[PDB]
């Protein structure tokens, strides 16, 4: 988890291509800023060459220092000055003849620098971190070199710089095009997406340049990165006109004059001449940062003026407890805190954004360009009665797994809300139709939570969070009754009216055990008509993270079933690998005749929801009259933007190629939560059960201790959402287990200060 | 219309001089060298924009290789080179003049190979710099009619397009090229970069590509040495084949055809790659009709009496056109106009649409979604200021994120509620509203529609039709006047202008409104819910406005809390941004959606008063307004619509904007609505901003519809309800050819 600081701007030199100038930028910039009239000590600029090659014959932080030294001069303004190199392959390194000792990747760490001190000076900082002798891509000169460096240690060499020296300006060169492999591969695009820096963009002024840079530009955009402005080298072409168009000026474009090509030549007239250019530039920079630095510390009040949160009570929350969030990178929030030194830092996105999250920074962003396309090709377009590829694919994708071996028809809606709703309505048709039909009611568990819409409150038990002054209209429409519960405390699986373990629980020889009969008569009893079920499978999400007994809802299914009553599976919450399968029918070893998706089906990304139906359900809207069809429709129906989305969601969670954690016989993910620390916060003092499955781990303390433990949680850099005195960790499907373990690791700590 | 049966691609690269000719001229001769026989064997060759010209010509390139590969293969073939079009200074080296510019060598009975350059400039810079420097202009429409009439005049066939410079260098005219044929939406190949920065070079120009809402099907580079194509396949997923030519000989002399020869192996695996894709690309639309029939259960329809050959293949949209797919016609891409903007969503232009796409992709990439509740985040908090700056000006001071109109609706009504039992110190709330209006297909939603069969048992064996509801008066133009028609519990305006007019709260129908009003109001009426000036769903009912303010002002008066549901009509459907701008009043609580989102993705909002926001303040969670869904002010949805309200509010990005910046100019024409409504067949019109209605009389509606879609126009029948629905940046150019088409075909 890092903590970058936004005091001072830090800012990615990106390029459209190789040696199109980005260090001359650099160089330019730096002069700017070094170079001004009053010189203050307290002025220093930090430029870091993350990665080179082609060195040591090639060395842009020798540049650098190098003409730095010589504007100085030029411009009779002292100047600190130092250049460092930090590692090295082996071969670069006998370059400098060092015979050093080399790393386990294979890296070697350089005593190597050049000073030239004024003390009381502006200070120039120059440091290539890791460099590699080959001048080619830094993947392949890895690979030849054998010298290695992964993608969280060049972040974290990064951060160090940073945090080292933190007036200030400092500038990361990259290596190469926007979209050049880094060391293990990785496009450097990506590589330094957790950091989201902003940037500036050194285009092309040659023919082809316009394409060249929009290219890049778009690539950088595309990655969720600002970039401040445009500069690139004049050919005498007028590249910029069409630039500052497409751009609609948004972003300014500087250009500077042509570059000298004798070879011999200083660049320093040309460099005095270019001051103009770079002025600008640095100017930019330094705006744009303080403007959104600006504008960060001015969200969280605006916010608490401006918006009406969900499931708030605005009274009780005040600007300190708002919480600014910047960007997302897989499961991590970018959250802004002012009160710390104005930075960013990262935050596990423990409550995925109320269980909707899923994706990784891999495939956040896969996702990214694919509702991009999606967006270019589709727009929004008419659903009724017209068929287009993402809306047919996603159908076809929920029937052949989800809905397989029951599911015939799959219909759209916006949220599970909807689907739910539509779900109720599918259910009371089927079975007036069976029935010839009056007051139609609902049979569900108290506890269960199926939307906030009116007919989705219908089916919800009368609470004191569910009735008059919330819904003026809702009557309880519904027989409810209390479901067995099941979770684990003090290391050992119950149930509330012992488990050898989990899977014991599931096992559906239990349909042959003494609760069987227990449970079949009970709801027999029971079971004004009773039109419809409707369950949370395995876990009442809402109602406290509460697992119900398995075998219970079986038979009640069972019990509905020989009634021709529809039975409706509401996986709004369970759908999609949140409990470590696809479908909840899965664990419950029966099918619905009606079941609705939403939350994780779309990936986490945005809005979309379906109701899958029996084609019996489906055949009692058959009819000649328009009257008979289900009159049920939201404008934005099946938008093929969730649709696409919802495709790739479906797809990349089931595959065992994109998901490390799908099992080997690619049903059931493998288990997340170490099974350790799982016992033993089970066994913990403050606990009073836990309950623990594929993505979720919730626990209920015995209020007091609730905001207390969420505030530490967050200290440690883990954003989650309370739910009563139950407090939950939820994970993506493709979140590794390494993760989860730092998770409950933190989390069993902070319960030590309740022993 | 563009035909499938035969494939045609475009030709893209990274960067200029990477060798798209060199791999037209391989997939050419690949194509025409083929050892088996047939005269019906025919490549066609299409450079539309060529520069450096007639020094350089990739025309004559592709012919000339040919020339010289057929000899080499033993293998007979026509070959053909023109030059359609050039500016006067090329033509003088061999505005924008016409040539009559020819190569032939026929040989009978064999393959064919035709090329063509469409147009020409002399100095070798961007087309759209030739263009201003040669004084030689080519219109974006023109280049693609052109090409058009080239595909059509020659429909075995494989067709070829090749580019000029980069994926997004730009057209004669500026427009991007990428941006230019976006409207045909083709395949197409890109010839990467195997050089130094090539890996970057590739994937961006790649990007670029999808991004505008392209397919490839394959890429291919020559190799310098530096194994690019394994980070490009990996990068790619291996999901489209990367192909490596063998170095381009260094000799300057090579006649480069042993290279050829040397490349077959690669050449031939792309135009198999190309011929592939395109059938399992046809193969796919002809089978996505009967598919849907049997996995898609659709909203409003009823299936029983839908059939395969009236399911509608929509393979993309550009701005207000579907891209339709038709085996009966020529297995061919047709446009078809959205004349219902897909259930009154729509609105972007080609042009918005495109930037949307790539403001809707950076938000994916930046924020996915991210937790609402006591967060905030950029694209929220924008819209968020922008929805009180604009719409909820004067009035608004809060807003509420859900997913649709419908639950912005079952949200508005719980508002109001809470509202009036706080002021009124509590029972049984009942709403009032106007018969017709329509507020969403949720439970809480239907409650405040009117009990009709479109709304009962059948539907939802909840309903209760827990309101009050009144028959309101209509306003319609009819036989070239506008007209009022009050119902029969109840009891011709110069233009529609007129009947707008504030001045009318003096007028005798004010008075008799108020009374007729007040005597039901006055099981506690709490709430009223409106859909301000037309009844939508209702059939496209113009209300007289009239009606509406008068009770608004009966109710304020009553402190029962006003809603007004504009899911419809917000942001532009009706030329203005809000229609409190034409009911000359404000509500206490109002709803958006649809166009809310400039037809891109679902968001709605629901802003209320700093009044009833405070009758939720208390000690107490409970207390709250514990309602909300998980996607609550989703970034996607927020960032779109941040783009939209801005975008459609300004007179730069929207020509239809008006000097006073608050209406948009008239886009149907007068005249013409004056025909349509003096005709026998229709009973009445109804037109303002960006809709168009007219209803029959009292069958003829199925003739229409079909009709009309015969001239490339879509639109969904509402009873005898017939609409147009433009989007607030279409030009009344369009509008004009549609009411034309629409006119002659009422001439039946
Ligand atoms: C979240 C949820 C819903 C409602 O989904 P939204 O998209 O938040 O409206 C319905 N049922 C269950 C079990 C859920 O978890
Ligand atoms: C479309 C509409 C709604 C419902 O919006 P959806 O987003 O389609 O659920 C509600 N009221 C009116 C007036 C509408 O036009
Ligand atoms: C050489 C290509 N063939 C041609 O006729 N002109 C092209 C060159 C123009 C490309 C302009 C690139 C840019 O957009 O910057
Ligand atoms: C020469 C540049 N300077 C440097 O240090 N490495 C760059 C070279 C690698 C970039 C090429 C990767 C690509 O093909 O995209």
Redesign the interface.
């Given at each position: 988890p890092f903590h970058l600081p936004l005091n001072h701007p830090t800012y990615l030199i990106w390029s459209?291509?190789?040696?199109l100038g980005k260090t001359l930028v650099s160089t330019g910039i730096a002069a700017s800023f070094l170079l001004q009239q009053p010189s203050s000590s307290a002025t220093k600029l930090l430029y870091l060459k993350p990665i080179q090659t082609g060195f040591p014959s090639d060395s842009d932080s020798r540049f650098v220092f190098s003409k730095l030294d010589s504007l100085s001069l030029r411009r009779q303004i002292p100047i600190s000055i130092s250049n460092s190199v930090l590692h090295s392959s082996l071969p670069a390194a006998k370059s400098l003849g060092l015979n050093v000792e080399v790393s386990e990747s294979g890296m070697c760490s350089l005593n190597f620098r050049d000073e030239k001190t004024v003390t009381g000076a502006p200070e120039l900082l120059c440091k290539t971190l890791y460099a590699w002798e080959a001048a080619?891509?830094p993947?392949?000169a890895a690979e030849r070199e054998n010298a290695t460096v992964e993608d969280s240690v060049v972040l974290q060499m990064i951060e160090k710089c940073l945090k080292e020296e933190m007036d200030l300006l400092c500038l990361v060169e990259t290596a190469?095009?926007?979209?050049?492999?880094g060391p293990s591969?990785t496009?450097q695009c990506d590589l330094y997406r957790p950091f989201?820096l902003p940037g500036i963009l050194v285009g092309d002024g040659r023919?082809?340049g316009?394409?060249?840079t929009?290219?890049?530009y778009?690539?950088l955009?595309?990655?969720?990165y600002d970039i401040a402005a445009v500069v690139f080298e004049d050919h005498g072409?007028?590249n910029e006109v069409?630039l500052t168009?497409?751009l609609r000026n948004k972003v300014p474009v500087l250009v500077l004059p042509p570059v000298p090509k004798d070879p011999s030549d200083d660049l320093i007239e040309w460099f005095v001449e270019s001051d103009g250019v770079f002025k600008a530039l640095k100017e930019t920079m330094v705006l744009a940062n303080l403007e959104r630095l600006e504008?960060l510390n001015g969200?969280?009040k605006?916010?608490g003026?401006?918006?009406?949160?969900?499931?708030?009570?605005?009274?009780?929350?005040h600007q300190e407890?708002?919480?600014?969030?910047?960007?997302?990178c897989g499961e991590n929030?970018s959250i802004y805190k002012a009160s710390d030194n104005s930075s960013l830092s990262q935050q596990f996105?423990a409550?995925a954004?109320?269980?909707?999250?899923g994706?990784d920074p891999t495939f956040?962003?896969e996702?990214?360009?694919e509702?991009?396309?999606?967006?270019?090709?589709?727009?929004?377009?008419?659903?009724?009665?017209?068929?287009?590829?993402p809306?047919?694919k996603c159908?076809?994708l929920l029937?052949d797994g989800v809905g397989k071996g029951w599911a015939?028809?799959?219909?759209?809606s916006?949220?599970?809300?909807?689907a739910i709703?539509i779900a109720?309505?599918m259910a009371?048709?089927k079975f007036?139709v069976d029935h010839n039909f009056?007051?139609?009611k609902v049979i569900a568990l108290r506890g269960s939570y199926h939307?906030?819409?009116?007919?989705?409150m219908?089916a919800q038990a009368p609470s004191?969070?569910?009735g008059f002054?919330?819904?003026?209209?809702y009557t309880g429409?519904g027989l409810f009754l209390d479901p067995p519960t099941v979770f684990l405390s003090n290391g050992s699986w119950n149930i509330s009216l012992t488990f050898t373990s989990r899977d014991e629980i599931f096992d559906k020889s239990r349909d042959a055990s003494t609760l069987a009969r227990i449970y079949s008569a009970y709801l027999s009893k029971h079971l004004a008509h009773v039109?419809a079920l409707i369950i949370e499978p395995v876990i009442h999400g809402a109602g406290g993270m509460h697992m119900v007994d398995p075998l219970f809802q079986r038979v009640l299914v069972n019990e509905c079933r020989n009634r021709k009553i529809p039975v409706i599976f509401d996986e709004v919450f369970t759908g999609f690998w949140r409990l470590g399968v696809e479908t909840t029918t899965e664990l419950l070893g029966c099918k619905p005749d009606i079941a609705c998706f939403?939350?994780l089906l779309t990936g986490?990304?945005?809005?979309l929801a379906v109701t899958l139906?029996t084609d019996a359900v489906?055949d009692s809207?058959?009819?000649?009259?328009?009257?008979?069809?289900?009159?049920?429709?939201?404008?934005?129906?099946a938008?093929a933007?969730?649709c696409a989305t919802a495709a790739k969601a479906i797809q990349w969670f089931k595959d065992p190629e994109t998901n490390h954690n799908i099992t080997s016989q690619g049903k059931t993910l493998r288990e997340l939560w170490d099974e350790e620390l799982v016992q033993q916060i089970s066994s913990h003092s403050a606990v009073q059960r836990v309950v623990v499955i594929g993505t979720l781990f919730a626990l209920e303390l015995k209020s007091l201790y609730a905001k207390s433990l969420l505030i530490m949680l967050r200290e440690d850099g883990i954003?989650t959402?309370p739910l009563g005195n139950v407090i939950y960790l939820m994970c993506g499907p493709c979140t590794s287990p390494e993760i989860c373990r730092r998770l409950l690791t933190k989390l069993y700590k902070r319960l030590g200060e309740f022993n």
């Amino acid at each position: 988890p890092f903590h970058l600081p936004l005091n001072h701007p830090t800012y990615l030199i990106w390029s459209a291509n190789t040696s199109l100038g980005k260090t001359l930028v650099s160089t330019g910039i730096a002069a700017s800023f070094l170079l001004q009239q009053p010189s203050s000590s307290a002025t220093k600029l930090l430029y870091l060459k993350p990665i080179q090659t082609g060195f040591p014959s090639d060395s842009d932080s020798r540049f650098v220092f190098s003409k730095l030294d010589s504007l100085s001069l030029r411009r009779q303004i002292p100047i600190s000055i130092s250049n460092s190199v930090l590692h090295s392959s082996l071969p670069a390194a006998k370059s400098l003849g060092l015979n050093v000792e080399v790393s386990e990747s294979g890296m070697c760490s350089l005593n190597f620098r050049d000073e030239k001190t004024v003390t009381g000076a502006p200070e120039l900082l120059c440091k290539t971190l890791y460099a590699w002798e080959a001048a080619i891509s830094p993947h392949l000169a890895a690979e030849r070199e054998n010298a290695t460096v992964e993608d969280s240690v060049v972040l974290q060499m990064i951060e160090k710089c940073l945090k080292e020296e933190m007036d200030l300006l400092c500038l990361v060169e990259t290596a190469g095009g926007v979209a050049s492999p880094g060391p293990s591969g990785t496009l450097q695009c990506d590589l330094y997406r957790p950091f989201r820096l902003p940037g500036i963009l050194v285009g092309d002024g040659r023919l082809g340049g316009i394409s060249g840079t929009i290219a890049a530009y778009e690539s950088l955009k595309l990655r969720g990165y600002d970039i401040a402005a445009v500069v690139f080298e004049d050919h005498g072409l007028v590249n910029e006109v069409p630039l500052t168009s497409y751009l609609r000026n948004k972003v300014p474009v500087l250009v500077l004059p042509p570059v000298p090509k004798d070879p011999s030549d200083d660049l320093i007239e040309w460099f005095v001449e270019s001051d103009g250019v770079f002025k600008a530039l640095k100017e930019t920079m330094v705006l744009a940062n303080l403007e959104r630095l600006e504008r960060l510390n001015g969200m969280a009040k605006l916010a608490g003026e401006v918006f009406w949160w969900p499931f708030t009570q605005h009274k009780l929350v005040h600007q300190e407890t708002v919480t600014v969030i910047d960007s997302r990178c897989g499961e991590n929030f970018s959250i802004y805190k002012a009160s710390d030194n104005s930075s960013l830092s990262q935050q596990f996105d423990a409550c995925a954004s109320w269980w909707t999250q899923g994706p990784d920074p891999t495939f956040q962003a896969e996702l990214a360009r694919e509702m991009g396309y999606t967006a270019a090709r589709f727009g929004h377009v008419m659903f009724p009665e017209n068929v287009y590829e993402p809306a047919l694919k996603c159908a076809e994708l929920l029937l052949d797994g989800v809905g397989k071996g029951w599911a015939s028809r799959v219909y759209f809606s916006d949220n599970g809300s909807t689907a739910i709703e539509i779900a109720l309505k599918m259910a009371f048709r089927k079975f007036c139709v069976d029935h010839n039909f009056i007051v139609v009611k609902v049979i569900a568990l108290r506890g269960s939570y199926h939307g906030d819409t009116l007919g989705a409150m219908e089916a919800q038990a009368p609470s004191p969070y569910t009735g008059f002054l919330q819904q003026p209209w809702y009557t309880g429409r519904g027989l409810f009754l209390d479901p067995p519960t099941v979770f684990l405390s003090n290391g050992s699986w119950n149930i509330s009216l012992t488990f050898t373990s989990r899977d014991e629980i599931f096992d559906k020889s239990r349909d042959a055990s003494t609760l069987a009969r227990i449970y079949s008569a009970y709801l027999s009893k029971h079971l004004a008509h009773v039109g419809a079920l409707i369950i949370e499978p395995v876990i009442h999400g809402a109602g406290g993270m509460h697992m119900v007994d398995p075998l219970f809802q079986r038979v009640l299914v069972n019990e509905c079933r020989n009634r021709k009553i529809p039975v409706i599976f509401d996986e709004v919450f369970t759908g999609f690998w949140r409990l470590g399968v696809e479908t909840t029918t899965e664990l419950l070893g029966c099918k619905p005749d009606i079941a609705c998706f939403a939350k994780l089906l779309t990936g986490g990304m945005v809005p979309l929801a379906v109701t899958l139906a029996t084609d019996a359900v489906f055949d009692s809207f058959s009819g000649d009259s328009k009257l008979k069809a289900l009159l049920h429709g939201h404008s934005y129906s099946a938008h093929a933007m969730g649709c696409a989305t919802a495709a790739k969601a479906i797809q990349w969670f089931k595959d065992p190629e994109t998901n490390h954690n799908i099992t080997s016989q690619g049903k059931t993910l493998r288990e997340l939560w170490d099974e350790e620390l799982v016992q033993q916060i089970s066994s913990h003092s403050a606990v009073q059960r836990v309950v623990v499955i594929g993505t979720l781990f919730a626990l209920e303390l015995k209020s007091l201790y609730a905001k207390s433990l969420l505030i530490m949680l967050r200290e440690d850099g883990i954003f989650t959402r309370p739910l009563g005195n139950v407090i939950y960790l939820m994970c993506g499907p493709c979140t590794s287990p390494e993760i989860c373990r730092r998770l409950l690791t933190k989390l069993y700590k902070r319960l030590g200060e309740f022993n």
